[PDB]
A paper describes a structure:
A pseudouridine kinase (PsuK) and a pseudouridine monophosphate glycosylase (PsuG) in Escherichia coli were first characterized as involved in pseudouridine degradation by catalyzing the phosphorylation of pseudouridine to pseudouridine 5′-phosphate (ΨMP) and further hydrolyzing 5′-ΨMP to produce uracil and ribose 5′-phosphate. Nevertheless, although EcPsuK and its homolog protein AtPUKI both belong to the phosphofructokinase B (PfkB) family of carbohydrate kinases, they share a low sequence identity of about 21%. Here, we solved the crystal structures of apo-EcPsuK and its binary complex with Ψ or N1-methyl-pseudouridine (m1Ψ). The structure of EcPsuK showed a homodimer conformation assembled by its β-thumb region.
Residue numbers in the entry: 2 to 308
The structure:
Amino acid sequence: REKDYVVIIGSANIDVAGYSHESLNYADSNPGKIKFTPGGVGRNIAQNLALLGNKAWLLSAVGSDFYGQSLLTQTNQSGVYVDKCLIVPGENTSSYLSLLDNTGEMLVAINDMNISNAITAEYLAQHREFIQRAKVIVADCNISEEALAWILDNAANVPVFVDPVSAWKCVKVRDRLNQIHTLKPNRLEAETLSGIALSGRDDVAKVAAWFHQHGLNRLVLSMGGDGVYYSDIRGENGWSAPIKTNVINVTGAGDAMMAGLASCWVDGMPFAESVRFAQGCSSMALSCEYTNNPDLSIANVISLVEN
C-alpha cells in the first residue's frame, strides 16, 4: 500500500577502500586504487529495502561537513527517504576505512562511528508518531543502548527487526529480547548473547531454546557454511541450506538478508519462505562487487531462489 512505509534506524558511513598497485612500500604514497562507498548497517538495509520496492525512511546521523551531505544525496538517488536524518553541526560524518591489498585481502581497517551517539532517544522522540505508524521498524545495534531501549519501549506494537551488527555491539539486546520481533545473529553473536557455545549444528536447538525462554519471538541464526537455522517461539523451526554463491565481496550480505526478512514480512509472506527469500537476497549482495547490489529486486531474488 502507498502509505505503508518502513523505518530504519542505524548508522550511515562512507566506506573508504584503498589498495596498492604492486606492493606496500611505506615510503610515502604508493599509487593504487581508492573507492568511496556508502555504508553503515542501517543505511545499507534502508537501501536494500528501497531496491526491493518499499518506501524506506532512514533515521540516522551525518555531520555538518560536506561529503556528509553527499552520502545522504547518494542514498536518496537509490530510493531512500533521507528527509529525516540528523545533520550534526560540525561533526565527523562516520566512515569505515579499510586497507585491502592487490589480493583483495583486507589488511587493517580503522572505524570512526562515534556520530552514532547523535542518534539519541530525544532525536527519535521527535518522530514518535511517524515511527509508530510504520509497517515495521529495523534497528541496528550501532546506536546506543538508550536509543535502542527507546525504540523497543515506543514501538506501539510495530514489530522491531534488530540487526546485532557485531559480537561487541549485540550485548545491548540481551535484556530486551522479549521486545524484539525478529533477531538476526550470526554464530558468534548468538554465542555471545546466550552464553552457550555453538560448536556445531547439534548445538542450535539449545541456543534457540535459550533465546525463546528469554522472550525472543523469532530467531534467524546464520551458521555460515552450515546454512541458516530459523526458530519461532510458537514452535516452528528448521534449517535452510546455503545457496551456492560465487562470492565476490562478502560485505553487505547481512544487510541484504535483514532487508529480505523485513520486506517479506511487510509483504505477508510466512516465516520459512521469508528466510529462503532473504538467503537469496544476501546471495545477491555477495556476488556483487559493491556493498549494496544495485540489481537487488523482487524479480531477481525470486529467480535466484529456484535456480
